[PDB]
Amino acid sequence: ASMIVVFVGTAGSGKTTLTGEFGRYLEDNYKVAYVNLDTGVKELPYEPSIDVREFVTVEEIMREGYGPNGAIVESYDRLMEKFNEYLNKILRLEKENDYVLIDTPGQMETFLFHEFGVRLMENLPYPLVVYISDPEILKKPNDYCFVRFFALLIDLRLGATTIPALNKVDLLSEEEKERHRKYFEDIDYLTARLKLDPSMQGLMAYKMCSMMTEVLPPVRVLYLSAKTREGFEDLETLAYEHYCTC
Amino acid sequence: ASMIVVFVGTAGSGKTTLTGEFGRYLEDNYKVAYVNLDTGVKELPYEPSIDVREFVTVEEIMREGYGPNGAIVESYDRLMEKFNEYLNKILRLEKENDYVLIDTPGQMETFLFHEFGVRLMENLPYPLVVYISDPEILKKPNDYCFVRFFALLIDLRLGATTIPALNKVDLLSEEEKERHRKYFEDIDYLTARLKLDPSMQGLMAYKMCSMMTEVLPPVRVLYLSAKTREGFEDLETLAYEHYCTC
Ligand SMILES: Nc1nc2c(ncn2[C@@H]2O[C@H](COP(=O)(O)OP(=O)(O)OP(=O)(O)O)[C@@H](O)[C@H]2O)c(=O)[nH]1
Ligand SMILES: Nc1nc2c(ncn2[C@@H]2O[C@H](COP(=O)(O)OP(=O)(O)OP(=O)(O)O)[C@@H](O)[C@H]2O)c(=O)[nH]1
Numbered sequence A, B: 001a002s003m004i005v006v007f008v009g010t011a012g013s014g015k016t017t018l019t020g021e022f023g024r025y026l027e028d029n030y031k032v033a034y035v036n037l038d039t040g041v042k043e044l045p046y047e048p049s050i051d052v053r054e055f056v057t058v059e060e061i062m063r064e065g066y067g068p069n070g071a072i073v074e075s076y077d078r079l080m081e082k083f084n085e086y087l088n089k090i091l092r093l094e095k096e097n098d099y100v101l102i103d104t105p106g107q108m109e110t111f112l113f114h115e116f117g118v119r120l121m122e123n124l125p126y127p128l129v130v131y132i133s134d135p136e137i138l139k140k141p142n143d144y145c146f147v148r149f150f151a152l153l154i155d156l157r158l159g160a161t162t163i164p165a166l167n168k169v170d171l172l173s174e175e176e177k178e179r180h181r182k183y184f185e186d187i188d189y190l191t192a193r194l195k196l197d198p199s200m201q202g203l204m205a206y207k208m209c210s211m212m213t214e215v216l217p218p219v220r221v222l223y224l225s226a227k228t229r230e231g232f233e234d235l236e237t238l239a240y241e242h243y244c245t246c
Helices: A015-026 A058-062 A068-094 A115-121 A141-158 A174-185 A200-211 A232-244 B015-026 B058-062 B068-094 B115-121 B141-158 B174-185 B200-211 B232-244
Strands: A004-009 A032-036 A099-103 A128-133 A162-166 B004-009 B032-036 B099-103 B128-133 B162-166
Touching: A004 A015, A015 A032, A015 A099, A015 A128, A015 A232, A032 A068, A058 A068, A058 B068, A068 A099, A068 A115, A068 B058, A068 B068, A115 A141, A128 A141, A128 A232, A141 A162, A141 A174, A141 A200, A141 B141, A141 B200, A162 A232, A200 B141, B004 B015, B015 B032, B015 B099, B015 B128, B015 B232, B032 B068, B058 B068, B068 B099, B068 B115, B115 B141, B128 B141, B128 B232, B141 B162, B141 B174, B141 B200, B162 B232
Parallel strands: A004 A099, A004 A128, A032 A099, A128 A162, B004 B099, B004 B128, B032 B099, B128 B162
Antiparallel strands: none
16 A cells, blocks of 8 residues: 655644644545654644654753754754664555655754755655645745745755645635736746846846756646645645656 | 855854854954844854844743744744844944854744745845855765755845855865865766766756756855864955955
């Protein structure tokens, strides 16, 4: 049955709530496992098969003299001592299930930059990555290219197909909803909207997502909502489509 | 005299030690101001003109019930209430000095993603960004393209020339020192080293920094060391060169 979905997203994207809700959505026609890799998240809305807080939490470490930024890094360093264990735990789940959903660190960068996250990921069988954004980071043509770009970066970094998505689209007025898809799905509209800006940066910014766009056929952005279950069917089949075309 | 240098880098890059040391290096032929924007860093090796911890620290906030990841975000939300104040504080320093050095959050992403960092930056006069990496993230041809890429991303994000650099090169055996420059400065060697990898990712990865490379003449990577002062003269003149060509 075997299939892994990694939720990546920055502090305040609501991806722990998504991981939870998307699981129950799956729990109806599928066996599902939940993996928590975040050492500093308080509560979790699901039942974890693997929960690294058992082994170490950011606070325990602070309760030993570390500045907050230094205690996240230090939680991930200690995790690596159980590196092989956690890998093999995950590999077991992978083929005892249809879906293993993986919830990554809230500081996205202790997943991009620390050894644990990075090595873990590059030793899993063709995992699917979902990069979710608060659609608020989306104010103007600039905000849109950065998101495609950063998804490309994560992909590069983890060596895993990374699909970009917006979460909490149920909070969007159709006003905004309209505005975002246009900019996202009509490549040759945004790719041309990046010229009405005449400044050191209102020019480069244009030749940026201009190429990345002309190399490997870009991806569809997912619109998701833990609250309405908008987009679950889509991601469901993107998962399956991914399991095929690999 | 006016000139701003923003040090960006992830938890464990040693850029607070760099900001400190590069300042004294400058303090000999220049008037210099130090700006700390990190709410969770304990001690600082310099004298801050602006220190946001006066107004709020990550711990005070934790001492009120926030999970660590939620207390960084919450420190930056409260900062934005003094947004205009901090902007004007910085603008005053800018032309009371030759250099204002700015030390950004240790969680690089509360600078890329929160409103404070991002808006602050895009309202400063042509600031220079220095992206520093622990050269350990550098193991193989992949690690190298990601770094160029991510510097491009920051640049895009903040609308500021962003220069990539390695810090702590004094810890490098000449063995490694040799190895990194080759991969970094001989474009058409790494840009061709990205083909001896035959896998979903050992192929895309090649067409990645292949284009970005063919659009706008790439940048020289700086090798820096707070401990030996390797690279200071270089960055010094890159600062000046930047102040010119703008
Ligand atoms: N309206 C709406 N609210 C949501 C949705 N998803 C999450 N929320 C709310 O926003 C909060 C997000 O919480 P989490 O899912 O834990 O966020 P997170 O991504 O784990 O946060 P970090 O760990 O910092 O990355 C929840 O408490 C929900 O109340 C959504 O789809 N729609
Ligand atoms: N050998 C050597 N050691 C260094 C150098 N720079 C910093 N260090 C050491 O590494 C540590 C880095 O500390 P910081 O400069 O505060 O690191 P930082 O970038 O502020 O860390 P974050 O806030 O998490 O991003 C220091 O305590 C130094 O002892 C260097 O250039 N060479």
